[PDB]
Amino acid sequence: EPLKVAFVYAGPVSDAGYTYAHDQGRLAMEKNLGAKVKSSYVENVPEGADAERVIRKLAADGNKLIFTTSFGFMNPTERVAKAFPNVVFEHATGVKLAKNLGVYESRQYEGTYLQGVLAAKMTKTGVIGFVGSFPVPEVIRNINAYTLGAQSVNPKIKTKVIWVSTWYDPAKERQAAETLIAQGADVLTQNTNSPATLQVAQEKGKYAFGCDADMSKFAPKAHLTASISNWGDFYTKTAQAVMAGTWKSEEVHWGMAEGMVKMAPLNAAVPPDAAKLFEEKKAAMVSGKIKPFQGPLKDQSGAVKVAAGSDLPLASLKGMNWYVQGVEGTIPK
Ligand SMILES: CCNc1nc(O)nc(NC(C)C)n1
């Protein structure tokens, strides 16, 4: 019989960003494994308590492998996994494991560091902007990596952050982008899921980056590049392991070296000196010659976090709740 695989999304496949990319991973798994797998998905599932009913129903319907693709499914996934010990659960970006519960994530911050390098080359104000969802480790690593990448070019760069308290709401994302631009940011990145920030950047004559997918068709003048998320090989490997009986609970983190994180082509507006530097830093990121959180690092209180010649430990990366010097908030509107 085919292995029944289900995907739980916190957003819509029509976001053209994060959920789109997870769903392209599901479709890659279907193409790679053919008749050996039967996939289904549910979109726009609310995070926290109400997700538990959806996850339980997919397990009750006979799914043997369930991917919960958002941070806020962590505790519902852990509870359903205890109730379904013969089902394999994989939770994106979480830190809770069990005999039948693994966690997976990308090192997207490797891409965000490269975006910061390019932002420092393209900014006219010296202020880069970040549209944030919630202050969880995934997002704080991306804010810090954007800032460190920019500071590798111009140590005087400032990063302004605005929080929308949602992963996906194109109206709120549009308003947040307008506010960052009004407060002097002219190269924007995000950890929300829509092309709204890009559309605002194009309207105002500013720059921004795609997130999880190439978003250039939404804003071809503003789109400098994008950090593309490729989940298809991970979803394939995981479904293969369950079918073959090799699956075990583990924490998986893949980056540019493993092909989970890739960069879109550069916009034609990027000048040759910036393009050359970007390609050198990209090669170094893939080879591990540079790491985004290599020392020396200080936090925003001036405390040393990592000495020169050391790297930030995996446990500090996993729990990151501190900001590098140069990160600030927006004035509340
Ligand atoms: C709709 C839920 N979206 C979501 N959830 C988690 O956990 N992380 C991300 N990250 C993107 C790169 C911003 N997005």
Numbering used by the authors: 28 to 360
Question: What does the report in the manuscript say about this coordinate set?
Answer:
Here, we describe the characterization of the periplasmic binding protein AtzT, including high-resolution ‘closed’ structures with bound ligands. Primers were designed to amplify the gene sequence without the sequence encoding the TAT signal in order to facilitate heterologous expression. The X-ray crystallographic analysis shows that AtzT is a two-domain protein, with each domain containing a central β-sheet of 6–7 strands, with 2–3 α-helices on either side of this central β-sheet and a C-terminal extension of about 45 residues. The structure of AtzT allows us to classify this protein into cluster B of the solute-binding proteins.
The structure with 2-hydroxyatrazine diffracted to a nominal resolution of 1.65 Å; it belongs to the same space group (P21) and has the same fold and closed form as the other structures that we have determined. The crystallography results thus verify the SPR results: a contaminant found in low abundance (about 5% of the total compound sample, but ∼700-fold more tightly binding) is the entity that is found bound in the structure. The same residues contribute to the binding of 2-hydroxyatrazine as to the binding of guanine in the binding site: Asn220, Glu165 and Ser97, with the ring packed on either side by Tyr45 and Trp194. 2-Hydroxyatrazine does not fit as well into the binding site as guanine and has some steric clashes on the side with the isopropyl moiety. The N atoms of 2-hydroxyatrazine are well within hydrogen-bonding distances of Asn220, Glu165 and Ser97 and the hydroxyl moiety makes a bond (2.9 Å on average) to the backbone N atom of Phe98, analogous to the carbonyl of guanine. We have also determined the structure of AtzT bound to 2-hydroxyatrazine and shown that the binding affinity of this substrate for AtzT is 2.2 µM, which is significantly (>600 fold) tighter than atrazine at ∼1.5 mM.
